[PDB]
Write a protein that binds this ligand. Structure first.
Ligand code: LO5
Ligand code: CL
Ligand code: CL
Ligand code: CL
Ligand code: CL
Ligand code: CL
Ligand code: CL
Ligand code: CL
Ligand code: MG
Length: 343
């Protein structure tokens, strides 16, 4: 067990191993930047806030730690370390997570740069490479958007901040909803991993035009923007919407055909237009998958089917388990103490 040292930074006590130096606040928890003297990396250290205050919160803490421990891929955030100052389960209260410190996100590039078509190819390729890996473990990200994509000076990209949101966070003119698939925005049906491909379509469109694709001022305004582009649903999709009320509302709207995407994404690579038409499909059964998209001709310069790995199997059966707070806490403690760092 390492030696820990204590300090107070912005009204919070931080107790961390000596290897982490020069802690400096930066931002579910509080976050500091630090220098990891064991690896030489600049890191983010996150101290969870009240990780075990309720059954819901204790299960959420376990879910986050299980997910971060599993993710081992070049285009996905990984876990560098996890620690607690507690010396036994009986005194276990605090959990700290350590990841690589991320600089700019895709917003700090989309808003503040000039992107060639080659940049768009490389950025979207990496998102899809990470998503092929995530989806192969039957994990759904659910919250893909530019602020959850880290990008460095060399255009290298990592997916972070998995969906692990409130009614109010999704209300109004807010980026937290602009990238969401319509079937989850309006609770049309049980969703699956196809929702992430809708989000990639929204992101790719924005890289090509420099503008948000569907910046709705509320749920209904956003739906109207979506249906104007991709057309109103036919009877085949309407059958799949479980809410009689949602079905009723959709049928109240005048019917519209799918638009010509070459006349929307003016001047874009025709192969980019084609791929957008295959991602931004209203019926989620018919969207292209991540594995299929990697083989699309838009990515011919980067696609390598021998360098696009899948994930180890991921057991999520705990999600249907009904446990007490102390049982979730004990499960989390076991995962902290069994952590093995990466090479
Ligand atoms: C307005 C009208 C629309 C629409 C989306 C919008 C709002 N975003 C503007 C465009 C700039 C090119 C792509 O995003 O989809 C169908 O009609
Ligand atoms: Cl140490
Ligand atoms: Cl990483
Ligand atoms: Cl503790
Ligand atoms: Cl964002
Ligand atoms: Cl058109
Ligand atoms: Cl799996
Ligand atoms: Cl597993
Ligand atoms: Mg985020």
């Amino acid at each position: 067990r390492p030696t820990f040292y204590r300090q107070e930074l912005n009204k919070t006590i931080w107790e961390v191993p000596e290897r982490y130096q020069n802690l400096s606040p930066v931002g579910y928890g509080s976050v500091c930047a630090a220098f990891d003297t064991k690896t030489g990396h600049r890191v983010a250290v996150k101290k969870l806030s009240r990780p075990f205050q309720s059954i819901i919160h204790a299960k959420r803490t376990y879910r986050e730690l299980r997910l971060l421990k599993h993710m081992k891929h070049e285009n996905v955030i990984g876990l560098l370390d996890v620690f607690t100052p507690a010396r036994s389960l009986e005194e276990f209260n605090d959990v700290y997570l350590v990841t690589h410190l991320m600089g700019a996100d895709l917003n700090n590039i989309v808003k503040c740069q000039k992107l060639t078509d080659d940049h768009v190819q490389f950025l979207i390729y990496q998102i899809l490479r990470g998503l092929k890996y995530i989806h192969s473990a039957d994990i759904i990200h659910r919250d893909l958007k530019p602020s959850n994509l880290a990008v460095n000076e060399d255009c290298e990209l990592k997916i972070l901040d998995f969906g692990l949101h409130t009614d109010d966070e999704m209300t109004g003119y807010v980026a937290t909803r602009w990238y969401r698939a319509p079937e989850i925005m309006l609770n049309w049906m049980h969703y699956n991993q196809t929702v992430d491909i809708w989000s990639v379509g929204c992101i790719m469109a924005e890289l090509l035009t420099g503008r948000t694709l569907f910046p709705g001022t509320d749920h209904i305004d956003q739906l109207k923007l979506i249906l104007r582009l991709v057309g109103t649903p036919g009877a085949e999709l309407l059958k799949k919407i479980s809410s009689e009320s949602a079905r009723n509302y959709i049928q109240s709207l005048a019917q519209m055909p799918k638009m010509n995407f070459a006349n929307v994404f003016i001047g874009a690579n025709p192969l980019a237009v084609d791929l957008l038409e295959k991602m931004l499909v209203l019926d989620s059964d018919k969207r292209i998958t991540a594995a299929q998209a990697l083989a699309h001709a838009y990515f011919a310069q980067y696609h390598d089917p021998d360098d696009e790995p899948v994930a180890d199997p991921y057991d999520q059966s705990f999600e249907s388990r009904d446990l007490l707070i102390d049982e979730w806490k004990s499960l989390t403690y076991d995962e902290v103490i069994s952590f093995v760092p990466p090479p």
